[PDB]
Subunit: 491 residues, 3 copies
């Protein structure tokens, strides 16, 4: 009682959180934050990306000009959304390398179309079908021109169209395969028919195949769709002796951030940068578990459902430096104004006071880690397909393997990052506690002794102002040294 | 001799192991474990994966029904093993996109076949050849039906088969290319021949090519093999005016964990989860150097032949805290009951005793690291091919580049992991030594002085029980303080 | 003045460098080195890789034997350089899967050609054109043999050539597509024409397409180029009823480190291991920002423009251990002979002296890090294409995605490496300072007190030799203990 006690300590909480570290699967810290986004609000926000809901139409149908898709003419988009309910209702068609055509249009991000005046002298234009009804009349694909005989003759066509513009042109055309030699005659007079479109660089030669296929909406015949790109200075050349489904012009083709996504999520009136087929997701977190398919500024897809980053010290209720969970037996739940602090007992009573500088030093370092991880996602746009409806073999094996490889490597990065940062966070918070203890020890010089539990026995009368002077670094040890030495060194 | 000495220390071994760290290429630790599996026992264990040894047959041969492969009918597998000795002994055939067909069947993991009654009215069935002898009789592929003329006519076929099941059907069929116009006539009457198989979604139109090719087992003619998948609600339609090698039914096609592997390793009667073409390998280690081609729960392939993870402290015979290989001059080889401990000299003699708590604290942290690395491999099944017998160009360049990219990234991860963990292991073991020293120092209060080499000069008579009380944390410094102070502070 | 002062400290510099760490975006260290190579000298060094400047010729042109490329006959290369100015000046041609042919030849790394004596009995050889003029005479591709009718007949060819060598043979051949039925007759007599080349394993059947295409240098007709590889024991078989552009022999095909690169950088007379299309770059740094396309022992391509690795301590003008930027208020700019040292004040004056052992300990650890990062790049040769002149869709999407995935993963590795190493460098340098302070403290025993700012108050007369004895570890505390204790413990 000619003595005082000053104890160093740290806070603790009743509701701790378990995190993983390098050396321990399960360690409790005072606070943590989740690094994996695991939920979507279920809506694709219409902002800030230009969304185009395909609704009942696929991109290719909107491209060809299925009557149902007339409203999509010349539209642009950042992201085209294809619905699973979509269906075609014009003339039955197939596209060799459908996936590539879908991909290049999606990436181009525009349906801008310019009509061109082709010289179809000698044939009937604007062929039409009951399989493709527009305004209650028999019709056809808006962007295609079905040519037939005129006066029972189909002269050999040799039609040309130069690109004298400064942009590429995307031409879509097709070949008709009648189900009977009869229909072939009726339509084109010729028995066979043959199509050949050329540029200076390319040749696409198609020979139609007369034959009945299983009926799609009662049609046993087909149209096969092809595309050719013509750059400035080049020339399109169309030779046909029949069966040619002619283009009415070209599509502008652009390069940019556009893409396409399969999803049944409704479009919402809201604003979110990251889109998944499940809906838009927040992008504050560096990782996400929602979908490997994404568009925009998105967290990276990982396999883990949760990854907790410690944002506080080890929680010790009741480190490499050995203070926290070390010579300091436990934390103080009653310290709610700081992370580290002092408890004292003197002549005037018992008190507690937080140390702000050490508290802030720990918090600044943790915020530095958070600044590296939170709100820094990277933009991805058009990628590769990652779900498949049909078996294809080799190329699909490769696309799947590439994505699986990527996810495992990011899942590894995420796992190690959290384990490493957490080990370091627990060590830096232990370090700050140790520094405060060491600083206090040096301050007291020969006037006190370390009791080994984070407490100092102070060998002199130390009232509240004296204790306060120690806490704020103005303690003058020389003032008390004589009193202290006499108390320490006696019998 | 009115004094005692208490020394803090750590163990050492005569047979140390060299490891790599962040700051040092070559540092000796007391113990380490290997992280790269570099050997196989040379056998593919038949458990716990269902192995199917192709022996003399390739998967495609077993699929088509080469007589040699009759025993493989309707078999399933987790892993099909193709031998380099395998050879075909039926009718000469090629498969366009052979690799894709092989891949999709392998992945399906079943040869389950259901016969279907096709209406081949107007043609001769069960065509047969001396190139494909079964039970000493001329025969053919068990799953294929060779159609020829009947009464010197081959009427146009238009055969249909609907899928009214709930599973997909895999149809295998082929086209015959006779080596002479003569054989073409003899077999099909028609001069040309043409095959066309269709679904609602697809058309495969093949025009046979009459001509002699270099003879395979004395046959200058060929059969080209094709496949079509028909989903529920869809319909197969076969038009042929000749040269059609007909299917006798369909294969069930499944999705699962099945795959195929090229290997000449014998099948063994044993149990191992990871299979490589070199044989099965243990999967206790996280990495392996045996083969980039694997199946099952396997360590990840890396380029390093060895990667040693330290599992003990730095070995100092004769860290950031500066105790081990620091102010403690060397380790104690004679300490074999613990990692850290005390050596003393007093009136009763000289002794040594291990400290169990600090020993266990270090061991627990190292075991925590091991638990993260040992026995946690990840299952891979069907992947991409990684060895190639023929030049292909673009697609093969891509498959090779993908695998090479993946291996370099995992080899990096493995290298950094070991360097980081080892640096940390050496630092945590140094830390535990420092904590024990600091704890002991505080215990002794004013009764001892640090001699600077991990030893304390104790300024009072301290018999064995006194030394023991220090080691077990029951030392009461107040008991000796007067004696100690008088000894310390004199002239 | 019956006392002395000994201060521990570290150096500082006026020109510090900002680096990134785990906990801080911007921290100043005494020195750093750049890890990202961002510049090229603009030349492709001709050493030590065998460079072949294509100049006006593409690889395929040199392969076919465009007259302009005669000088390239039988050349080999490690790297073939294609110029953007290159142009073809022989007969107009296209190659289906051009990219694959270009790739396999580039990778083979040789134009070694062996002539073979084919039996072209019944046809005219050495066909020739005004579209391909050699030495001012009408000519043709040096490696191809244009066959035409002889005496207005073109008999069915059935020509064979066995591979009885021990190496593979690469055969290049082609099909001619005349622009008129007239030219077809004039050249081959036959109305149609058909080509079929076979091996035991393969068949390539081409049917020429008569028709005019847009004129390339006034030619409306084309030659389509094909290749076939024939292994030892196999046989090439050529059937043609017309339009066959015949091979004159085979190319040797090798496997090795060769590749091809598009670049307009001049070839220089110098020596560099890493080549980019921008020019050769130094490979001392682990990363580079110059080009994702590389050949040789090259730093890895990353997205960051700069990544600074700290190679010195924190710069404090005017860590987890709390010495540097901690209880030591600031560094000493006047200490230029070491990183750590002593400053003293005694009866004889004030002095400064570096500590070499602690200085060297820090430097050795930093050099250990540098040794892991500097001068250890990995060799890559033939890879995948990474820039594209035409839209292709699916396969190109995959090639782009693979490269983008790889770069992001390496960019991550590089970012984390620097942040981690820098945090550790700052901590190890702080640690060395702390160790020196602790060692000095123990040396002084009871003869001095820690003033809390890295300085010791020494409680006895300590001349220059005495101070020197402390710095070199020969200080005998017992010599001064009586004097010191009397000074410390008084009133
Ligand atoms: C080839 O076979 C198919 C199947 O029998 C025929 O297609 C059917 O034709 C009938 C009437 O002609 C339709 O009512 C069916 O809906 C069709 N079925 C399918 C699946 O398309 C086809 O007519 C036959 N070809 C010829 C020329 O006879
Ligand atoms: C085309 O040429 C090949 C090679 O000369 C001929 O194939 C050979 O035919 C003979 C007997 O007819 C056999 O003994 C050889 O084994 C065959 N060689 C090969 C490599 O197949 C073929 O007959 C010729 N075509 C025609 C119709 O004459
Ligand atoms: C098909 O159309 C093209 C374009 O009109 C014709 O090619 C032109 O032919 C004339 C003279 O015959 C040349 O002067 C032009 O340079 C050619 N243009 C191009 C782009 O090639 C071609 O002649 C026509 N085909 C036929 C058989 O008449
Ligand atoms: C602990 O409780 C407080 C208030 O109830 C809350 O703010 C804090 O987030 C809780 N800790 C956690 C993360 O459970
Ligand atoms: C837990 O940590 C996060 C990130 O620092 C912070 O947003 C949250 O407020 C913290 N909770 C408490 C109780 O401090
Ligand atoms: C989509 O098609 C369905 C018919 O299945 C119809 O109910 C609906 O009106 C269509 N929506 C639009 C926008 O055309
Ligand atoms: C074909 O129809 C389009 C509108 O669909 C029209 O612009 C054009 O005049 C028609 N051409 C002929 C010859 O009927
Ligand atoms: C293909 O099948 C049907 C029925 O015979 C028909 O479309 C066509 O005539 C067939 N092909 C030939 C060459 O007869
Ligand atoms: C998102 O969709 C996928 C299926 O495409 C599903 O596996 C996953 O559970 C969904 N995620 C969430 C959080 O809804
Ligand atoms: C330090 O604490 C003492 C005691 O309360 C007080 O008198 C003084 O204002 C404080 N000094 C500073 C600089 O904060
Ligand atoms: C050292 O020797 C002992 C027994 O001979 C053995 O258990 C230990 O593994 C050895 N250390 C190594 C890894 O060489
Ligand atoms: C070396 O370390 C490994 C892993 O902890 C252990 O299995 C082995 O027993 C150790 N050897 C010795 C001598 O302790
Ligand atoms: C495999 O083929 C060889 C002939 O090369 C023969 O010796 C052996 O009997 C065959 N094995 C089986 C199981 O058919
Ligand atoms: C064809 O052979 C199979 C057995 O190989 C038999 O089931 C079928 O009855 C035969 N059909 C005819 C018409 O011979
Ligand atoms: C192809 O070559 C051989 C020999 O002439 C034969 O199979 C066939 O007759 C040839 N093709 C034609 C169209 O004659
Ligand atoms: C495994 O096989 C590969 C060849 O496929 C060979 O390069 C490697 O040396 C083998 N590994 C072992 C450990 O046998
Ligand atoms: C501590 O050591 C002393 C001396 O041997 C002994 O008397 C006592 O049993 C020990 N106490 C405990 C709690 O282990
Ligand atoms: C600081 O200046 C010296 C000499 O002027 C120079 O050697 C050193 O590199 C400079 N530091 C940096 C990296 O700016
Ligand atoms: C800075 O660090 C690098 C690498 O250690 C070294 O080359 C350079 O000389 C250093 N500069 C100074 C001023 O020491
Ligand atoms: C390359 O072609 C150009 C013509 O554009 C010519 O000036 C130059 O001589 C050619 N170079 C060589 C080496 O043939
Ligand atoms: C064809 O020309 C080549 C040289 O270009 C020559 O070696 C060969 O003798 C010629 N053959 C004939 C039949 O003219
Ligand atoms: C293709 O177009 C041109 C002009 O008619 C010509 O090359 C050829 O005659 C055409 N094809 C047919 C089958 O007439
Ligand atoms: C190298 O070339 C690429 C274009 O291929 C360009 O983007 C980049 O700026 C160039 N880098 C340097 C350092 O010249
Ligand atoms: C230590 O320093 C003292 C004082 O200068 C000097 O006498 C002696 O040579 C030094 N000893 C050693 C071993 O360097």
């Amino acid at each position: 009682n000619s003595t005082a006690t000053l104890c160093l300590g740290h806070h603790a909480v009743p509701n701790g959180t378990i995190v993983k570290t390098i050396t321990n699967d399960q360690i409790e810290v005072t606070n943590a934050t989740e690094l994996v986004q695991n939920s979507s609000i279920g809506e694709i926000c219409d902002s800030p990306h230009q969304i185009l809901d395909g609704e009942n139409c696929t991109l290719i149908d909107a491209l060809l000009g299925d009557p149902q898709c007339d409203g999509f003419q010349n539209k642009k988009w950042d992201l085209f959304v294809e619905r699973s309910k979509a269906y075609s209702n014009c003339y039955p068609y197939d596209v060799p390398d459908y996936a590539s055509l879908r991909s290049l249009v999606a990436s181009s991000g525009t349906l801008e179309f310019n009509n061109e005046s082709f010289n179809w002298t000698g044939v009937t234009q604007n062929g039409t079908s009951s399989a493709c009804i527009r305004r209650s009349n028999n019709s056809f694909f808006s962007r295609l021109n079905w040519l037939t005989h005129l006066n029972f003759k189909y002269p050999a066509l040799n039609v040309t169209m130069p690109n004298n513009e400064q942009f590429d042109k995307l031409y879509i055309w097709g070949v008709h395969h009648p189900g009977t030699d009869k229909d072939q005659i009726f339509l084109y007079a010729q028995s066979s028919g043959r199509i050949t479109v050329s540029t200076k660089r390319s040749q696409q030669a198609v020979i139609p195949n007369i034959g009945s296929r299983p009926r799609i909406r009662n049609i046993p015949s087909r149209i096969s769709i092809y595309w050719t790109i013509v750059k400035p200075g080049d020339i399109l050349l169309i030779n046909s002796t029949g069966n040619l489904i002619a283009p009415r012009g070209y599509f502008k083709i652009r390069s940019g951030k556009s893409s396409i996504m399969r999803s049944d999520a409704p479009i919402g009136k809201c604003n979110s940068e990251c889109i998944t087929p499940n809906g838009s997701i927040p992008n504050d977190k560096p990782f996400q578990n929602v979908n490997r398919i994404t568009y925009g500024a998105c967290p990276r897809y990982v396999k883990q459902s949760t990854l907790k980053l410690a944002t506080g010290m080890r929680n010790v209720p009741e480190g490499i430096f050995g203070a926290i969970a070390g010579f300091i037996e436990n934390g103080w739940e009653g310290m709610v104004d700081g992370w580290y602090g002092f408890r004292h007992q003197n002549s005037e009573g018992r008190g507690q006071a937080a140390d702000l500088k050490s508290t802030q030093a720990a918090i600044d370092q943790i915020n530095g880690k958070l600044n590296r991880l939170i709100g820094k996602t990277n933009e991805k746009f058009h990628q590769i397909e990652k779900e498949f409806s049909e078996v294809e073999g080799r190329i699909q094996d490769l696309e799947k393997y590439v994505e699986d490889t990527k996810i495992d490597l990011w899942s590894y990065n995420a796992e190690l990052l959290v384990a490493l940062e957490n080990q370091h966070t627990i060590d830096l918070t232990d370090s700050e506690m140790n520094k405060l203890f060491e600083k206090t020890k040096k301050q007291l010089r020969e006037n006190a002794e370390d009791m080994g539990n984070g407490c100092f026995k102070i060998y002199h009368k130390c009232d509240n102002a004296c204790i306060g002077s120690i806490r704020n670094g103005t303690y003058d040890h020389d003032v008390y040294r004589d009193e202290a030495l006499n108390n320490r060194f006696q019998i």
